[PDB]
Design a protein around this ligand. Sequence first.
Ligand code: HEM
Ligand code: HEM
Ligand SMILES: Cc1cc(N)nc(CCCCCO[C@H]2CNC[C@H]2Cc2cc(C)cc(N)n2)c1
Ligand SMILES: Cc1cc(N)nc(CCCCCO[C@H]2CNC[C@H]2Cc2cc(C)cc(N)n2)c1
Ligand SMILES: C[C@H](O)[C@H](O)[C@H]1CNC2=NC(N)=NC(=O)C2=N1
Ligand SMILES: C[C@H](O)[C@H](O)[C@H]1CNC2=NC(N)=NC(=O)C2=N1
Ligand SMILES: [Zn+2]
Lengths: 403, 405
Amino acid sequence: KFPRVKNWELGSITYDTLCAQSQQDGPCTPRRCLGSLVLPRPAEQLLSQARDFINQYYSSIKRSGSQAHEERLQEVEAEVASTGTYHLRESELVFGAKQAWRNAPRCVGRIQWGKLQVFDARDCSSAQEMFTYICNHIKYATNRGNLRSAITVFPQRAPGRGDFRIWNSQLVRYAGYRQQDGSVRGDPANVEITELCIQHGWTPGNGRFDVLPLLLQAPDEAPELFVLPPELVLEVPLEHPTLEWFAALGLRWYALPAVSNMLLEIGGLEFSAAPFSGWYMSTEIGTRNLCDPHRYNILEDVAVCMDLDTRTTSSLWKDKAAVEINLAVLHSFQLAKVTIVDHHAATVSFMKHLDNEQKARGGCPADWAWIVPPISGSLTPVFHQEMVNYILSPAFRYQPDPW
Amino acid sequence: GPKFPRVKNWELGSITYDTLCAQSQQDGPCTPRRCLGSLVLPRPAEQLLSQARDFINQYYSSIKRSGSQAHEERLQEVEAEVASTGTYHLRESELVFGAKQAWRNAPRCVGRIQWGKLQVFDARDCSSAQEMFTYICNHIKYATNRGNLRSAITVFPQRAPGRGDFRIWNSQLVRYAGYRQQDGSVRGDPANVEITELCIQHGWTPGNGRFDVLPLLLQAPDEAPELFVLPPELVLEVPLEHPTLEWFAALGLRWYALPAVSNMLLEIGGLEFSAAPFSGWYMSTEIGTRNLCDPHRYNILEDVAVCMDLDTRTTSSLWKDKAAVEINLAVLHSFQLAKVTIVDHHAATVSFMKHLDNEQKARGGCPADWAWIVPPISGSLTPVFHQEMVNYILSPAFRYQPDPW
Ligand code: HEM
Ligand code: HEM
Ligand SMILES: Cc1cc(N)nc(CCCCCO[C@H]2CNC[C@H]2Cc2cc(C)cc(N)n2)c1
Ligand SMILES: Cc1cc(N)nc(CCCCCO[C@H]2CNC[C@H]2Cc2cc(C)cc(N)n2)c1
Ligand SMILES: C[C@H](O)[C@H](O)[C@H]1CNC2=NC(N)=NC(=O)C2=N1
Ligand SMILES: C[C@H](O)[C@H](O)[C@H]1CNC2=NC(N)=NC(=O)C2=N1
Ligand SMILES: [Zn+2]
């Protein structure tokens, strides 16, 4: 039965028919819903995924049933039957990468999905060459603050051998130095990767915002360490439009959000290294990165500085400090002329995206818990919107850590 | 290791496994193909007996008498009663247990740390609309307790074969009128437009304010509903002021003290209680964020922002966030000053975390609807945002039911 999907603010209703196109199970069953969980719980198979994807591609260019379409299916079929695998043409890769983003249920920025620079790095044969491609990506995507969405696709997994992998979870990560007294200096999210870096020969610093080097891995080789050139890593000092002492906090964040640990799956083929980047929504930095108790955890420091009544929850000191921190992020990025979007503008765009996709494809997979921002949830339109979550391919997926 | 859902807390790094979900006898809306967890309304013969037996087993387990002679005798009693009459009836102590369990089982309620403290008024003798009203007034008086609020439920007679239901037509015991205007807008609470118009159709003379308390429309078996005005002195309200913004008081906003849901069905051992209103106390975000700030509710965000002199022309000033915070603070401050029980969303969610731990030990899990548990402002500032949750239907349960009209 195709789900009825309701918007409770507007009273409008849609039916999701796109979900019938899902060929991949999620974690929920009729007995229990596991929608809030962060992590998920032969040749004929490759052949049907490949054919389905080639069909998707030729349909997108309006060329279903054409000579080119029939001949491409034969090529794919021939290659799989002989070798157990196949290869994508660059145009198919570009279409596949955009579709993977379009299909990502946890992404509120999908209004932008058709605007993605795709770097084909499948001719990469060494960690050294990976570093070169990553530097070109960062340079292109950063664009002096006028951020442009981009993906670089390194060579696919092959049955015979180890994967190409970028060990770091993002291309830009701040060190987290664990103390002998358990506590952390820097970003506690990055304790493990920091220690892997030191262990692979990196000389650590001792600051709160030390940019990590990249550990890059070519198949069946020890990862290699590469320091990013400082001028490639654009950063924004954080200050507040009216609170003078805020800048004295010595806070900063990086411009470029680039996820580097996810697997890109297109037509059954798997790209274990395919880092992608857009621009930040302010709550990612202002709310999560800076205010999570297990991240930089600055709420109390800011509250004290604001002279708020910390003695009690009902003064709403946490809520007040968080708002000001989010404002400082927005102010500071605007001042530095670095692309950023606030959570109201981003969720308004997502509502438009939902409407675009309803008309174009008859639905849109969306993970409500991820779409709704971590402050002011019900003040955004997406809170009042019912959403259907399911897996379509092409897809970005999680994968095991390479160590 | 375990073949039960693994549940992680990402703030603390701690892991549990929910084994309680094995006890679910009712399907929700999700399938392996697609998750429908965000939907608001998720899409008897020997059937009664097996539900009845399961509930009786639950009762005797809770008093540690499973397998006992008293347990086996009650089972026989129930099947005998069903055998001859088609239905059965609960002992008083069974109703009390069943009502607390239904609250304990409610995935959408963040206040469940309180589940063991519920005053259960047994109104299964009620035989008229007038008597329903007396019971409800008594419930309201007891629950409100001059501002020192106490959780209560009043249970009216169960649904019976081929006989009409007891129903309360209003969705809550206290509701503000919503009057549709000529221009298409609403004065009062747009949530209550339909029930307002139904009160008018049934003979209520409407006011014209923003906070007019509605009458109750009460229905006894196979009769037209009857209209009852709540004595104004029974309905405690709190005028809203702000601790530092002196003009906020001039806005004339207010809310009532007692949150009392009256349109849900209480199901216990297959028996169905179609009128069983229950009340607690408010979490401040229900009033200050949803009721006052929803675009389709009182919608006051812009008015407050304008008074605070914020830049309302651009999303990036965070004018909405700043105004909502102050409205929420006004709610807490005003209830505190008025000595009326209220709980903020930080304190509520902290206590729900304690509840989750209690239930892990007591029952091996706790059904919880993440979208409902996470507060509508400051989500990730609260510990529940970082907590994975497993949602499933246990019985006894509170359920939605069709509107009487
Ligand atoms: C255009 C700028 C973009 C904005 C404002 C945006 C917005 C977001 C936000 C707010 C999240 C949640 C992040 C978190 O909570 O940590 C997210 C996640 C995601 N986004 Fe987008 N996004 C953008 C570009 C992209 C691009 C270019 C791709 C792929 C090519 C993408 C794919 C994803 C994926 C796969 C996730 C989930 C990541 C994970 O699960 O760890 N995003 N995005
Ligand atoms: C003791 C103080 C209590 C607090 C602070 C509390 C808190 C809450 C909150 C914040 C919600 C979400 C409501 C919304 O978003 O509109 C809720 C829903 C719910 N609560 Fe509790 N609660 C309390 C007592 C109770 C009692 C006594 C019962 C039943 C005996 C109960 C059963 C429920 C049910 C069934 C829902 C879902 C309502 C619906 O789906 O319409 N609560 N409660
Ligand atoms: C493209 C893009 C745009 C934008 N605005 N922001 C980003 C950054 C997304 C960062 C997401 C990282 O998620 C981690 C940390 N919190 C939840 C967790 C989920 C997860 C788990 C795993 C194993 C991998 C992964 N990528 N993500 C990327
Ligand atoms: C006991 C209690 C404590 C407390 N703090 N707050 C309350 C009030 C809960 C009111 C819940 C109302 O929910 C309505 C309005 N928004 C979603 C919708 C869900 C719903 C639908 C239907 C058909 C019935 C119903 N009871 N609830 C009750
Ligand atoms: C347990 C819960 O699912 C996690 O805390 C989720 C909640 N929602 C979330 N939403 C987003 N956008 N990013 C997150 O990391 C995130 N964490
Ligand atoms: C579409 C979405 O499920 C609704 O807007 C939900 C989200 N979470 C919610 N949570 C709570 N506590 N009450 C709600 O009314 C509510 N509405
Ligand atoms: Zn689900």
